[PDB]
Every structure is written in C-alpha cells, then in structure tokens.
Design a protein around this ligand. Sequence first.
Ligand SMILES: OC[C@H]1O[C@H](O[C@H]2[C@H](O)[C@@H](O)[C@H](OCCCCCCC3CCCCC3)O[C@@H]2CO)[C@H](O)[C@@H](O)[C@@H]1O
Ligand SMILES: OC[C@H]1O[C@H](O[C@H]2[C@H](O)[C@@H](O)[C@H](OCCCCCCC3CCCCC3)O[C@@H]2CO)[C@H](O)[C@@H](O)[C@@H]1O
Ligand SMILES: *[B]([O])([O])[C]([C]N1[C]=C(C([O])=O)N=N1)[N]C(=O)[C]C1=[C][C]=[C]S1
Length: 265
Amino acid sequence: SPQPLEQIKLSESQLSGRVGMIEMDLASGRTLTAWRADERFPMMSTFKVVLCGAVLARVDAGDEQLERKIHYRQQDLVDYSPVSEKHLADGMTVGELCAAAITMSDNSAANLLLATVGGPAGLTAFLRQIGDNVTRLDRWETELNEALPGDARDTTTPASMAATLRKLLTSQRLSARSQRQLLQWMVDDRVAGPLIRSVLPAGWFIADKTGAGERGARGIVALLGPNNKAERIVVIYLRDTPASMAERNQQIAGIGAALIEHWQR
Ligand SMILES: OC[C@H]1O[C@H](O[C@H]2[C@H](O)[C@@H](O)[C@H](OCCCCCCC3CCCCC3)O[C@@H]2CO)[C@H](O)[C@@H](O)[C@@H]1O
Ligand SMILES: OC[C@H]1O[C@H](O[C@H]2[C@H](O)[C@@H](O)[C@H](OCCCCCCC3CCCCC3)O[C@@H]2CO)[C@H](O)[C@@H](O)[C@@H]1O
Ligand SMILES: *[B]([O])([O])[C]([C]N1[C]=C(C([O])=O)N=N1)[N]C(=O)[C]C1=[C][C]=[C]S1
C-alpha cells in the first residue's frame, strides 16, 4: 500500500467524493495524519458515541443512572430498532440503551437517550461544555442522515471528532469507570467490529462506531493499534460520492491498510 496520505488521495480520486481523515495518538493527542481535517462531514450514527459520553457525564454527576429503566411505546420507534423493538413490554435500562445505540446502532435507542440529554440542542450544549465549538447535532434519527450538500446540520470535522473522543475517553472529564464503559461499548461493536477483526492482521486492536447516510455518506470513528493496544484514534468520513456501499467500505479499509503498513511515523 502507498503512504496514508497518498492512499487517502487515491480513495478520493476513485470515489469522486471528499474524504476527511484524522489519525491521533490517544494518550497524547498528537496528530499524525490529517486530510480535510477542518472540513465538515455528516456524523451520521457516529454521533452515538458522543451521545453516550453526555449520558455518562450525567451519571457521574448523579443526575442519571445506567440502571434506570426507561419504558417506551411502539409509536416512539423509528427506522432500525433491532434491540429496542424487542423490549416494548419490559423497557430497557439507560446502559442497555447506550449499548444498543453504540454496539448495534439502534436508532430508537439513540433517540430515547437523546431526549434524556435535552435533544440535539442539549447534546450540542454538552459538546460546547467540553470545548468542541464545531460539532453540532440538529436532528434526530433518522433525518440526521440526510447529508444534503452544503448543509451544516448534524456535522463534525475529523479534527473536532477526534479531539472530542479523546476528551471523553482519557481527559478525566468522565470518571474512570465511565471512561472504561465508553471504551468497552466501542470494543463491543457488532455492526463492523467482528468483520474488521477478520481482516486485520493478528495483534491489531479495534474498537469502533460506524455510520452511514444518504448521498454516499459513510464514516467510522475507531481506536486502532498494534500489540493489542488502543494506540490511536482514527476518524474517517466520506461524503458526496455515488459509489456502492461495498466500494466505500473497501476504500476505508484501504486507508486502514496504509496506516497498518506505515505505522511508525
Ligand atoms: O491481504 C493482503 C492485502 O491487504 C491489503 O488489501 C486490502 C485493501 O487495502 C482493502 O481495500 C480491502 O478491503 C476489503 C473490504 C473489507 C471491509 C471491512 C472494513 C470496513 C467495514 C465497515 C466499516 C469500514 C471498514 O481488503 C484488502 C485485503 O482483503 C493491502 O492493500 C494489500 O497491499 C495487501 O497485499
Ligand atoms: O505488513 C503488515 C501486514 O500486511 C498485510 O495485512 C493486510 C491485511 O491482510 C488486510 O486484510 C488489511 O486490510 C485492511 C483492513 C483494515 C480494517 C481496519 C479499518 C480501519 C478503518 C479506519 C478506522 C480503523 C480501522 O490490510 C493489511 C495491511 O496491508 C499482511 O496480510 C499481514 O500479514 C501483515 O502483518
Ligand atoms: B446512523 O448512521 O445514523 C444510522 C444507522 N447505521 C447504519 C450504520 C452502518 O451501516 O454502518 N451504522 N449505523 N443510519 C441509518 O439509519 C441510515 C438511514 C438514512 C436515512 C434513513 S435511515
């Protein structure tokens, strides 16, 4: 594989869309590779990690409990609710909701959680509280996936998202236990985690949250490193490409391959 930046460029050339990419050391925040890192991209379901960061902050403050059981109605459900559609009788705990939202990308779980933090506005306020002055959520699932050209709603930048994830996972804004919980939810991703592991060389750690939307929008926020360590945050977003889902996935993987082959930078 070519160097990371060369492969990123190739992926744009082949997709006819924009790619946005950060690679950042988790422990220090060193930026290693940056491409369109200050340009806006739809977050799609990647927002679910930030959402559960806000939830965990409420837990730490004593305003929320992961044990608390939430009951909801069938008319509350939106498209793609693999876990939440199964618990209409009995409800789900706040922690189960976060697990469903992160590990299965359950849309209704995310919306229920989003209400508890004050909606898109409340999550955006949380982002401002932790010093992210760029990322914004405006809409609920599933409208937030619309990815209209030129629309700043429901967007982040690769740099902002990487910084935000580092802040949530390592900065002690969250309690140790909450940091540990957020990481474990990413480790437990069932949408892409197992597939990613099956194509990674032995020894490479992965934790992730994926997203997909309209107009080609696709993305992943991930922790990756050799010796079975979460060494780096890697954020990759694609937008405005007409390519198949399969080819988008291949291109994201090709960027991954480039990182793996040229890791010591
Ligand atoms: O196996 C050996 C080969 O491994 C890589 O090839 C990669 C390629 O770079 C990537 O484009 C493709 O993607 C295949 C698609 C896999 C999709 C899984 C990852 C997705 C899942 C959903 C979220 C984003 C990531 O895999 C091949 C190997 O199989 C190297 O590029 C190549 O030089 C090397 O000789
Ligand atoms: O020398 C490095 C490695 O080169 C190859 O590994 C290939 C692997 O066979 C292929 O399956 C993968 O595809 C890439 C799969 C990447 C999935 C991770 C996706 C990223 C996306 C962004 C967030 C982090 C995860 O590339 C690597 C590197 O060429 C060899 O197969 C392997 O024996 C060797 O250790
Ligand atoms: B998310 O990206 O907001 C959500 C669910 N989803 C899909 C994936 C994936 O494929 O990796 N991860 N999480 N996306 C949707 O529900 C897609 C929709 C776009 C318009 C209506 S639904």
